[PDB]
Design a protein around this ligand. Structure first.
Ligand SMILES: Nc1ncnc2c1ncn2[C@@H]1O[C@H](COP(=O)(O)OP(=O)(O)OP(O)(O)=S)[C@@H](O)[C@H]1O
Ligand SMILES: Nc1ncnc2c1ncn2[C@@H]1O[C@H](COP(=O)(O)OP(=O)(O)OP(O)(O)=S)[C@@H](O)[C@H]1O
Ligand SMILES: Nc1ncnc2c1ncn2[C@@H]1O[C@H](COP(=O)(O)OP(=O)(O)OP(O)(O)=S)[C@@H](O)[C@H]1O
Ligand SMILES: [Mn+2]
Ligand SMILES: [Mn+2]
Ligand SMILES: [Mn+2]
Length: 1666
């Protein structure tokens, strides 16, 4: 190895090696130098120069048109940044297209730079140059997840490699990580350094994901001229003949002269004297300014002082100090007056200093003076070379020994440092050439010679960090087995560098016949994984190769902790650990083992050990004790004099944050409250640089040290600083001047009040509702947009953690009017009850920010002990013959015998008429239990009416579909029916039908007037299926109707049997006695008696970002399907209907990653294409074409039918359903995945947990057995919920009543029917409720505190009186102080009629008490509470806003994330006939379903108040049925009548539809040949027009009446989902009087009179006469 230049010159002690600067050699004229005549865009960044150099010339074609990866290798200071700029502009042009700049959320781009200085400089440059495009450039920094999350909301992200690697390792930003499309890697020769492995990790994982998924991510790399560049090219997966570029020194815009000097291998003043001589030569004779590079903040000033002193003596300051008046005066004045940093008074001599320890203003002044020419010699550090654009003619790198504390020794400079330093040599437009000198030793000259002459190979250093990096890939789920590990390792720089030089990497030569070093990659991974197995970071099945990450491995990856350090932490941490032992554990980290104790620093160390508070039991002058006291002294803010000691301390403190956070999370996951809180406090000590015993004001940067000093000289407790004003603040602090200052600081200190509500669920688990209220003024400068907190729940002893979570407080929600947040969790409890628990809310970053709360159990009453389940008797299986009738036995031809649940319940269901309750797991046969009662009922020739009830319309619909087909041909007639919703139509079905299926609300509506309707009294059989769902939402009406049926059979002595079905109950005695069942008729079977046993796997996840968690669960579900149910169907439930499509895509991409795209397809696509063409949703058609398909509420009926056909016939194997249709889903699988147990609720701005009944219902679909005879489920939840959902999946389901929370809406219906005329009537009614029977069993769940009859009666009295008070303060009920009497007003009548909430009713009456206009009723209707039950999808703002700007009527105060605003906008969208996306259109459908009922209610309200504007509201009813405004012309009702056609007809003088049909031309006018041709409609469209125009369009003593007609009541309304009948309103009056007449809702030759103390159609526009 001896390549070099031309000349050597030996001297007394040094050896000058001079390499000539190469000529430009621009003889090849093929160099284009492209003129900036690009398109209008991509020209705005290039403003400072109108021409591109030769390198950007050669790179432009593939950088601006092609998309492939790219590698450029240019000399130092060449102009490579603009190549990356070209690629950025191409990616920009990809998104914004079609003469219009489009959204920036469609793409992101990352720029990876080696050091922070270059990161910030590039942030500035790219921000300035891309600001006209509107895009934001941001630096990824802060080390806090809440600021990095906000930073990742920008497109151009500049970052260091370690920061990007740790961001991707945490995997809590993948939703935006997937948006990146281009990655720029600057100075890739860092791969040779010890930091190269992080770049290898980044590039390998990115390229592997892009190659296995197809989603392209462009990679552009900028590097220097070093050998092995084609190696890093192939590692970057670049085409050599398309995107590889290598430019020699001849392409440098300003050629550099290299000069190497080395002192003889005494005296180190030789380097300083040589620098002084070279300063004399270049600044004196050549008159060139120059900069020198040293590697210390103090050594730079030392060398500058030495040069200036040696120039002072010997009268040599001349030739250096400019002598003109201007430069001298400017230097003198600027230095003496403006600058503040000491040792900077070298400026009057023309000298300048620069390093990171100076002010930003001082550095900018130095930069401006050097650029202006006033500074000739500038001594500086590497931060200048990395972060400023300040070039000089001459650059001297003085010294090559730099201290590395991580290695604890003096090492040589890194190649990237010297290359960046020499990049500043030679000005491009001032001088012809540049000069770069390196001053080193004699034994290190060949190293830098090879470095600068392209002879320093770039070798991989991944092995030293393999075990760690592999672990990361496992924690990400990208490496689950040996083969995936080898696939990952094949995308690293180590792999290609091993393929080229096997002997140099000691492969061992055993792998001679090893293709692609495959056997070398397993042997290299099996070892690494083995280590990970022994440190307990990974679970590694040696045989099957499968690997999985443990929580320790996840913590190690998230915090960049070595496996050795993790081993030490896990082995050393114990729950009783104090601060001393925690510091000792910190000091035993492997990241610091190479730091030795030195006698040179024996004194200071001792001086430091006496000033640090924490005792150091470790032996003095031991490396661990050294770094311990280093951390402590850093926290103590102590100045240090030792240089290497200062470097060691800087290193220790840079690592301290990660190490202490890892310690904290270790203590947290093991559930040790004391040491967890201590470790969190230590994290705060290190990150804020303060002990807990000092003033918390130290956390504020802008707080003057005088105030801190004063406060720490005081004894005032910190809590006494709060709840004051500036006067009292200054008075309390003894310093009036500061009164306003610190008052503004403590007011911004994160403060939170908390409240707790405890509800016992069982004797071993409580449910806690925690209300958190912000009590501090927000400030973005020191808070950001979100503040993180920890919720901890500790024992009475404070020893273990019973619950912990993160609470993220957003700025928008914190400073809101109603800013209260809620958190609902569960904690266990032992039967000897502890006196109390503790709840702490502790800031994650701020010290002394903690709100603590006792949770006392002295008043808590645990519910009654659960009794044993009814045992499953091992009886002889009952044959079907036991039915005693072939008629009934024909109904069950598939099975010879019933299962043991049906045989054990057979006698009491089929041979007796007693009330029965059967509780069994889902999928056990309970429908047969109901059919037993049905068959006995129909055996009796009386054959009374039976009523089946199910909680949801989907369940009654499936039940009807089955029973109307199976149970039709029977003894007499079938006539089984299902109700519709309106009383008059289903009452005829009740009179007509023998078996009436209904929902709780449908049966409620007609069972209210049971006294006047004998058909409700004569009901002999009543089956309440899914009775436990009374605890589900809208389940209180179920409880109401069951209690009312019992009351009915108790009033009328007629016999009435009740049969209840539910899942396995924890408390079945109360439900059984509720329906008056005998002890022997209450079958509450164990939750394990399901005929097909269920294997249940639970998987925990810790990902605070919801889209990231949802993406993270995708591949585990693929693995669960492929391994647990490979050849059997599978169903996967997701939290949202929009999540079904996303999860379908994620699963399909996981299939692509496994090199099997159609893995879940089992039929040729050509056989399925016939049906695939029929699907409406394109995403569903694609997923089905690859064999997945999904199912959600927004799917059309045909799409559901196609999905069901394809799934049942085995064509597709997987099915992804939303949790919103878990009851409707008429499907069955061998495996059921529950991917997530949370859904976002718009009201509370938070995620709610799945009801347990929902998880039971979803796992009840797992009924197809394997050869094992068992079904399989996997439940994927957050970790904090695991023990909850486990608890109530292996134990029965507890059911409580929420009727006490909906008593107003129940009393509305009760009092409206005079069923409750007084408060004692209300108490008597309540006695019939399950709530009442459950007050004695679990009183603390309902707020009751005295279990005696006195306390119970007092509780009921308080409850009914408060409910009647709520209904009386609202203008609904009539009740006063005289007696507890209540009377229903006209409001309660229509409230119970139209089935609207009482809150909606109150706000209706309040906003309508004054006669309002139509534009006001539009705002009032959409504010109803019924619409608040509609889901809000995240990030749908803007769409609603974009369509709200295209809308005539608007509200004064809009809330863009409210259901009110959504309904308000969507109703007007319906009116304007605007296209809507799928989910928004389904929401609009849901709106329109109820808006008509709400409008009729408002009509009745305004008629009750007697105001005229009632006649306005009914007009609204037309507008929604016909989807048009009141201003619009009638002609828009005709089909295919675009407003263009409306104006074409208006030109022909057509205003009404009557004028349209009268002006048709069979024989009327010759306008046909003109009008038809002007309308542009085809004969089919004209026929469809004639259809509507001819077939469906219409044509106090007393008051006379006279009516006539021109029919089918069916209304033609293509835009209204459902059916309507043509009603009419009749009322008249006077306009000036502002009073209305009585109005009667006329039906369809009907003469109706009117008592006087228009004909208003509800669905058409040709409405009224005058
Ligand atoms: N076409 C151009 N016309 C004028 N100046 C240019 C042009 N291209 C680049 N430069 C300037 O050349 C200097 C160096 O280019 P950069 O790409 O920013 O740095 P560099 O090439 O990466 O140097 P290093 O030390 O290797 S990082 C900058 O000051 C640019 O503004
Ligand atoms: N003895 C039996 N042998 C085999 N299959 C049966 C038997 N009894 C019922 N099944 C079937 O097994 C499935 C169980 O569904 P069901 O038990 O009727 O519903 P459920 O478990 O009571 O809960 P629901 O329907 O949500 S109220 C149905 O497909 C039945 O047809
Ligand atoms: N741990 C938490 N504590 C409190 N509120 C939370 C928490 N997680 C989520 N939220 C709330 O739920 C909302 C939705 O959060 P996520 O969808 O998980 O992520 P995100 O914060 O919205 O990030 P974006 O909006 O996608 S950039 C947040 O805006 C919060 O209001
Ligand atoms: Mn660069
Ligand atoms: Mn059932
Ligand atoms: Mn396809």
């Amino acid at each position: 190895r001896m390549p070099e230049g031309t000349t050597k010159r030996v001297f007394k002690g040094y050896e000058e090696i001079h390499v000539p600067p190469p000529k430009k050699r621009s003889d090849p004229t093929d160099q284009n130098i492209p003129v900036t005549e690009l398109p209008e865009w991509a020209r705005i960044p290039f403003n400072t120069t109108k021409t591109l150099n030769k390198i950007q010339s050669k790179c432009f074609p593939t950088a601006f048109l092609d998309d492939g990866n790219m590698l450029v290798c240019a000399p130092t200071g060449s102009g490579k940044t603009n190549v990356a700029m070209l690629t950025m502009l191409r990616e920009i042009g990809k998104n914004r297209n079609e003469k219009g700049e489009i959204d920036l959320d469609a793409f992101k781009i990352v720029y990876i730079a080696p050091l922070k200085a270059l990161v910030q400089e590039q942030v500035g440059n790219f921000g300035k140059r891309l600001e006209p495009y509107g895009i934001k450039v941001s630096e990824l920094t802060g080390d806090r997840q809440l600021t990095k999350q906000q930073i990742s909301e920008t497109q151009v992200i500049v970052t260091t490699p370690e920061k990007w690697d740790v961001i991707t390792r945490k995997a809590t930003d993948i939703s935006y990580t997937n948006l990146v499309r281009l990655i720029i890697i600057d100075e890739i020769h860092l791969l040779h350094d010890d930091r190269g492995p992080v770049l290898e990790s980044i590039v390998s994982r990115t390229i592997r994901r892009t190659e296995q998924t197809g989603e392209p991510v462009r990679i552009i790399g900028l590097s220097a001229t070093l050998p092995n560049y084609r190696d890093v090219a192939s590692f970057l997966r670049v085409d050599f003949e398309k995107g590889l570029f290598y430019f020699d020194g001849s392409y440098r815009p300003c050629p550099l002269r290299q000069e190497f000097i080395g002192v003889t291998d005494k005296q180190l003043k030789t380097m300083n004297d040589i620098t002084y001589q070279k300063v004399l030569e270049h600044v004196g004779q050549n008159r060139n300014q120059m900069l020198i590079f040293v590697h210390s903040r103090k050594e730079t000033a030392k060398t500058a002082k030495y040069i200036r002193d040696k120039a002072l003596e010997m009268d040599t300051i001349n030739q250096i100090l400019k002598h003109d008046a201007g430069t001298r005066e400017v230097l003198q004045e600027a230095a003496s007056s403006v600058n503040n940093t000491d040792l900077k008074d070298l400026l009057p001599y023309g000298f300048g200093i620069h390093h990171a320890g100076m002010s930003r203003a001082d550095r900018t002044d130095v930069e401006d003076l050097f650029a202006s020419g006033h500074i000739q010699v500038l001594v500086c550090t590497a931060t200048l070379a990395w972060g400023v654009n300040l070039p000089a003619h001459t650059v001297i790198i003085k010294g090559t020994q730099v201290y590395s504390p991580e290695k604890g020794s003096w090492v040589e400079l890194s190649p990237q440092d010297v290359l960046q330093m020499l990049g500043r040599a030679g000005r491009p437009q001032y001088d012809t050439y540049g000069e770069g000198i390196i001053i080193t030793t004699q034994g290190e000259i060949p190293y830098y010679l090879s470095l600068l002459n392209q002879q320093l190979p770039i070798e991989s250093q991944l092995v030293s960090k393999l075990v760690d990096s592999l672990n990361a890939e496992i924690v990400l789920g990208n490496v689950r087995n040996r083969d995936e590990g080898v696939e990952w390792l094949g995308y690293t720089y180590l792999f290609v560098r091993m393929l080229r030089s096997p002997g140099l990497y000691s492969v061992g030569a055993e792998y001679e016949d090893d293709v692609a070093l495959e056997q070398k990659r397993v042997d290299l991974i099996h070892s690494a994984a083995m280590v990970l197995k022994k440190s307990n970071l990974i679970k590694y099945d040696e045989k099957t190769g499968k690997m999985q990450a443990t929580e320790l491995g996840r913590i190690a990856s998230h915090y960049y902790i070595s496996h050795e350090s993790m081993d030490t932490y896990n082995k050393l941490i114990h729950p009783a650990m104090n601060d001393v032992e925690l510091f000792r554990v910190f000091a035993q980290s492997g990241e610091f083992k190479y730091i030795p104790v030195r006698q040179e620093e024996k004194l200071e160390l001792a001086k430091l050990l006496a000033r640090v508070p924490i005792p150091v039991k470790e032996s003095i002058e031991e490396p661990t004790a050294k770094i311990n006291v280093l951390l402590q002294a850093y926290i103590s803010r102590l100045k240090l004099e030792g240089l290497a000691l200062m470097a060691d301390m800087v290193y220790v403190t840079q690592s301290a944050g990660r190490i202490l956070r890892a310690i904290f999370e270790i203590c947290l996951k093991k559930g040790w409250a004391s040491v967890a809180k201590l470790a969190l406090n230590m994290c705060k000590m290190a990150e804020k640089r303060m002990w807990p015993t000092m003033s918390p004001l130290r956390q504020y940067p802008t707080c003057p040290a005088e105030i801190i000093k004063k406060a720490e000289r005081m004894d005032v407790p910190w809590s006494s600083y709060f709840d004051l004003d500036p006067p009292r603040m200054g008075e309390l602090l003894g310093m009036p001047k500061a009164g306003k200052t610190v008052c503004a600081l403590v007011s911004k200190f994160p403060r939170v009040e908390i409240q707790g509500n405890v509800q016992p669920m069982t004797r071993s688990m409580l449910r806690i509702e925690l209300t958190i209220t912000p009590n501090f003024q927000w400030d973005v400068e020191l808070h950001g947009v979100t503040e993180s907190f920890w919720i901890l729940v500790e024992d009475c002893d404070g020893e273990e953690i019973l619950f912990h979570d993160v609470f993220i407080l957003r700025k928008d929600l914190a400073e809101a009017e109603e800013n209260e947040h809620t958190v609902e969790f569960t904690v266990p409890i032992s039967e000897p009850m502890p006196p109390n628990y503790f709840i702490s809310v502790i800031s994650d970053r701020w010290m002394h920010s903690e709100t603590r709360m006792p949770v006392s159990f002295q008043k808590l009453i645990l519910p009654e002990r659960f009794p044993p389940h009814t045992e499953l008797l091992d009886l002889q299986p009952l044959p079907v013959s036991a039915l005693k009738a072939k008629d009934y036995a024909a109904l069950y031809p598939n099975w010879q015998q019933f299962n043991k649940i049906q045989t054990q319940t057979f006698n009491s269901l089929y041979n007796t008429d007693n009330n029965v309750l059967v509780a069994a797991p889902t999928g056990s046969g309970k429908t047969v239990c109901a059919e037993f009662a049905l068959l006995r009922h129909w055996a009796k020739k009386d054959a009374g009416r039976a009523v089946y009830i199910a909680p949801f319309q989907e369940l009654v619909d499936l039940r009807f579909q089955d029973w109307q087909k199976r149970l039709s041909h029977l003894r007499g007639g079938k006539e089984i029916v299902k109700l519709t919703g309106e009383t008059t139509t289903d009452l005829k079905l009740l009179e007509q039908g023998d078996l009436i299926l209904a929902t709780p609300l449908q049966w409620d509506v007609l069972s209210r007037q049971w006294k006047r309707r004998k058909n409700v009294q004569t009901v002999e059989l009543f089956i309440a299926d899914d009775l436990h769902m009374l605890g589900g939402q809208m389940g209180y009406i179920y409880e109401i109707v069951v209690s009312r049926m019992h009351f009915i059979r108790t009033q009328t002595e007629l016999p009435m049997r009740i049969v209840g079905l539910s899942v396995s109950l924890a408390n079945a005695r109360d439900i059984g006695e509720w329906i008056d069942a005998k002890k022997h008729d209450i079958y509450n079977f164990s939750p394990h008696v399901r005929p097909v046993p269920l294997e249940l796997h639970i998987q925990s996840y810790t990902i605070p970002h919801f889209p990231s968690l949802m993406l993270a669960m995708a591949k585990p579900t693929y693995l669960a399907i492929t391994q647990l149910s490979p050849d059997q169907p599978a169903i996967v439930f997701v939290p949202s209907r929009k999540q079904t499509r996303a999860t379908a895509r994620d699963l399909l991409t996981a299939c692509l990653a496994d090199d099997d795209e159609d893995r879940f397809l089992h039929v040729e696509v050509d056989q399925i294409r016939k049906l695939l063409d029929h699907v409406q949703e394109e995403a569903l058609a694609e997923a089905l074409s690859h064999g997945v398909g999904y199912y959600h509420e927004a799917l059309s009926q045909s799409d559901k039918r196609i999905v069901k056909h394809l799934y049942n016939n085995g064509a597709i194997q997987v099915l992804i359903a939303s949790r919103d249709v878990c009851w409707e889903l008429d499907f069955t699988a061998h495996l059921v995945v529950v991917m997530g147990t949370q859904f976002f609720e718009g009201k509370e701005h938070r995620y709610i947990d799945y009801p347990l009944s929902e998880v039971l219902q979803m796992f009840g679909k797992a009924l197809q057995p394997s050869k094992d005879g068992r079904s399989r489920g996997v439940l994927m939840l957050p970790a904090v919920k695991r023990e909850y959902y486990k608890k109530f999946l292996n134990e029965a389901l507890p059911v409580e009543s929420h009727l006490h929370n909906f008593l107003p809406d129940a009393f509305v219906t009760e009092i409206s029917t005079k069923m409750i005329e007084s408060g004692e009537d209300a108490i008597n009614w309540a006695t019939f409720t399950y709530f009442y029977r459950r007050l004695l069993a679990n009183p603390s769940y309902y707020g009751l505190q005295d279990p005696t009859h006195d306390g119970l009666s007092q509780y009921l009295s308080d409850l009914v009186e408060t409910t009647l008070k709520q209904l009386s303060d609202a203008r609904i009920i009539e009740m006063d102080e005289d007696e507890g009497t209540v009377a229903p007003l006209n409001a309660a009548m229509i409230a119970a009629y139209y089935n609207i909430s009482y809150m909606t009713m109150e706000m209706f009456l309040l906003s309508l008490s004054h006669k309002s206009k139509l534009r006001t009723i539009l705002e009032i209707v959409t504010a109803a509470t019924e619409f608040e039950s509609i889901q809000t999808r995240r990030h749908e703002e803007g769409i609603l806003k974009r369509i709200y700007d295209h809308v005539p009527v608007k509200m004064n105060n809009p809330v863009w994330d409210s259901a009110h605003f959504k309904a308000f906008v969507l109703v007007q969208a319906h009116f304007s006939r605007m296209n809507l996306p799928i989910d928004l259109a389904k929401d609009q459908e849901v709106i329109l379903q109820k808006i008509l009922s709400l409008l009729s209610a408002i009509v009745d309200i305004l008629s009750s108040e007697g105001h005229l504007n009632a006649l306005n509201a009914m007009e609204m009813s037309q507008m929604v049925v016909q989807a048009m405004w009141d201003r619009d012309s009638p002609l828009k009702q005709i089909p295919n009548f675009t407003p263009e056609v409306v104006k074409v007809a208006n030109k022909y003088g057509i205003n009404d539809i009557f004028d349209f049909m009268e002006q048709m031309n069979p024989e009327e006018n010759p306008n046909y040949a003109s009008l038809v041709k002007d309308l542009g409609l085809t004969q089919a469209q004209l026929a469809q027009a004639a259809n509507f125009t001819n077939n469906k369009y219409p044509d106090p003593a007393y008051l006379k009446i006279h009516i006539e007609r021109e029919f089918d009541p069916t209304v033609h309304a293509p835009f209204y989902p459902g059916k309507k009948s043509e009603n009419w309103w009749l009322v008249v009056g006077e306009e000036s009087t502002k009073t209305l007449l009585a109005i009667k809702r006329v039906t369809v030759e009907l003469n109706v009179k009117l008592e006087f103390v228009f004909l208003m159609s509800d669905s058409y526009v040709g409405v009224d006469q005058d």
